Amino acid sequence: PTVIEDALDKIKSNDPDTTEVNLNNIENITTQTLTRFAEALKDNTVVKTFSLANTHADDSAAMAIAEMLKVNEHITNVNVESNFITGKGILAIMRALQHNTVLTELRFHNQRHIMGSQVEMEIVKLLKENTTLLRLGYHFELPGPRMSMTSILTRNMDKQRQKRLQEQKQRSAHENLMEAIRGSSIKQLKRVE
Amino acid sequence: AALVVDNGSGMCKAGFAGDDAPRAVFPSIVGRPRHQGVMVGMGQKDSYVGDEAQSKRGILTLKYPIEHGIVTNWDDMEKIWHHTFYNELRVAPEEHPVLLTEAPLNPKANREKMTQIMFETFNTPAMYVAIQAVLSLYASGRTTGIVLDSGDGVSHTVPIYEGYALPHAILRLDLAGRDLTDYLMKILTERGYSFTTTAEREIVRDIKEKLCYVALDFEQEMATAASSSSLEKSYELPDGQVITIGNERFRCPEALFQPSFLGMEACGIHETTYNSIMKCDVDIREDLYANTVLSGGTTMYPGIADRMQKEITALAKSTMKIKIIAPPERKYSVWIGGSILASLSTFQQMWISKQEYDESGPSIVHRKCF
Ligand SMILES: Nc1ncnc2c1ncn2[C@@H]1O[C@H](COP(=O)(O)OP(=O)(O)NP(=O)(O)O)[C@@H](O)[C@H]1O
Ligand SMILES: [Mg+2]
């Protein structure tokens, strides 16, 4: 429910009033069209969210996006869900994020096929060196990579907690609680369906 | 004005503290385009959540953020939580403290991330984290006992002493309601009608919940079944056809007591409970025996508590009294216990405040909670 031609025209025009780029559920299925969307956004600075969900996008598009994420320094969120990307395109993007300070959310759910154990542990390896990414939209099948990842994203957000900390700056109770929990019952609660 | 949120492995119940029941109950589930690229009924969306996900399933692949009570996808977990606050509950997380629940033996990393999401993303004034089993004990008006929490994915035995679960004596059994729908599926398929379509597996789960029960004496109810038709019951599928099961009714949940029926070398829930009690201090065992609380949807079978009393009475010492408590509202006992707790004025001192987190970070959850 969005026209590709004129919107793209606004990207390369760097229209001040285009902070969202939403290509979700579009039949275009043109690898070239999406790859020139990447080049279009490459020098853009207004866009903060570039999404293409379920567009039959392939690995090349993931490559264009991958290299580009280092040029573009204003997109905070990228979405490539429900497309057909392999560990190649995804790992390319991750290697891009090896040095990319802006991007903070990246989602690739419901892909064509499983990434693979080695691909997942690779993801966690690369992103170990990233500090700005806060949300990763993927379900790791292996517990190791998954726990490593949640630890990473926790410390990246913690950096926000710390920087905000310095910026903004410059038992009887339990026993009585239990005594209270024993004296309770459902008859004290607001009846509602 | 506290909020309570019980995140089940497959069902999410969220509401306000001090309420009799949760105001919101929807499937903890996030669905996305099935596949074959752009075969879309959705206009401009990348995914659906909650009720909209259960419907529209025709072209959706439905994925749960919580597996076996442990968060395995934190992005879809944050989605479910946003959907909870803003779409189903209609509240600002910034103006309410939040009580969240976790499963027994939850990793510390997931506890920290839970807290970090609550304080950073949703910017809640305060928040707290409690074990579901413990909130079921509190809901039964008890502070000491042992809880058998069997839900969708996994089953846990949790000894509790004066408000603190005992991690050394917690026991885990990887057998729950879904294993019993699967079992019932197989025994029904084998003998005549094929239950393959998931839409029909929902019919199998409905048979389970409507007609299955737990036999006190299995080999007697088998012999009764073979001698007479006294135990037969029929069920009306959607196409008007009817099926008659009798012997499957109690064989399905028998797996809870004999996991071997599912090719499992583990021991049933009765042994798992007793064994947990034996790992506890010999002083409190007698109050564990007398206070064995049931929670979770899989504990709703008729006669489940009767056979608990029998089998555990056979394991324990002739001296002890074995009382098995099977509350009503056992499907929502976790939430209701949370509603009580969050309502108690004696609990307001226990919340974690956002300033404490801003100082110490999410690690503060390991103490000040457990
Ligand atoms: N009357 C019933 N008889 C038997 N099983 C039932 C009944 N009602 C519900 N169930 C089952 O109970 C389960 C629901 O348990 P539930 O209380 O939702 O746990 P959960 O929180 O969603 N998952 P978990 O986090 O693993 O405890 C499902 O497998 C249902 O099929
Ligand atoms: Mg539960």
Swiss-Prot record, chain A:
Region Interaction with actin 3, residue ranges: 173-192
Keyword match Ion transport: no
Protein's cellular compartments: Cytoplasm, Myofibril, Sarcomere; Cytoplasm, Myofibril; Cytoplasm, Myofibril, Sarcomere, M line; Cytoplasm, Cytoskeleton
Gene Ontology molecular-function annotations: actin binding; actin monomer binding; tropomyosin binding
GO CC annotations, alphabetized: actin filament; cytoskeleton; M band; myofibril; sarcomere; striated muscle thin filament
Amino acid composition bias (Basic and acidic residues), ranges on this chain: 157-170
Associated pathology: Cardiomyopathy, dilated, 2G: A form of dilated cardiomyopathy, a disorder characterized by ventricular dilation and impaired systolic function, resulting in congestive heart failure and arrhythmia. Patients are at risk of premature death. CMD2G is an autosomal recessive form characterized by early-onset, severe cardiomyopathy that progresses rapidly to heart failure in the neonatal period without evidence of intervening hypertrophy.
Protein family: Belongs to the tropomodulin family.
Quaternary state and interactors: Can bind at least three actin monomers and thereby provides a nucleus for actin filament formation. Interacts (via N-terminus) with tropomyosin alpha (TPM1) (via N-terminus). May also interact with TPM2 (via N-terminus). Interacts with FLII.
The protein's role, per its UniProt record: Mediates nucleation of actin filaments and thereby promotes actin polymerization. Plays a role in the regulation of actin filament length. Required for normal sarcomere organization in the heart, and for normal heart function.
Protein name: Leiomodin-2
Organism: Homo sapiens
Annotated gene: LMOD2
Part of the intact protein present: 196 to 541 of 547
UniProtKB/Swiss-Prot annotation, chain B:
Tele-methylhistidine modification, residue list: H68
Post-translational note: N-terminal cleavage of acetylated cysteine of immature actin by ACTMAP. Oxidation of Met-39 by Mical to form methionine sulfoxide promotes actin filament depolymerization. Methionine sulfoxide is produced stereospecifically, but it is not known whether the (S)-S-oxide or the (R)-S-oxide is produced.
Record has DNA damage as a keyword: no
MF terms in GO: ATP binding; hydrolase activity
InterPro entries assigned to the protein according to its UniProt record, in alphabetical order: Actin (IPR004000), Actin/actin-like_CS (IPR020902), Actin_CS (IPR004001), ATPase_NBD (IPR043129)
Matching CDD domains: ASKHA_NBD_actin
Short name of any one Pfam family annotated for the protein: Actin
Gene3D superfamilies per the UniProt record, alphabetical: 3.30.420.40, Actin, Chain A, domain 4 (3.90.640.10)
GO (cellular component) term, any one: Ino80 complex
EC numbers on record: 3.6.4.-
Biological-process GO terms, alphabetical: chromatin remodeling; maintenance of protein location in cell; mitotic cytokinesis; ovarian fusome organization; sperm individualization; tube formation
Miscellaneous information on this protein: In Drosophila there are 6 closely related actin genes.
Assigned protein family: Belongs to the actin family.
Assembly mode: Interacts with Rab6.
Entry protein name: Actin-5C
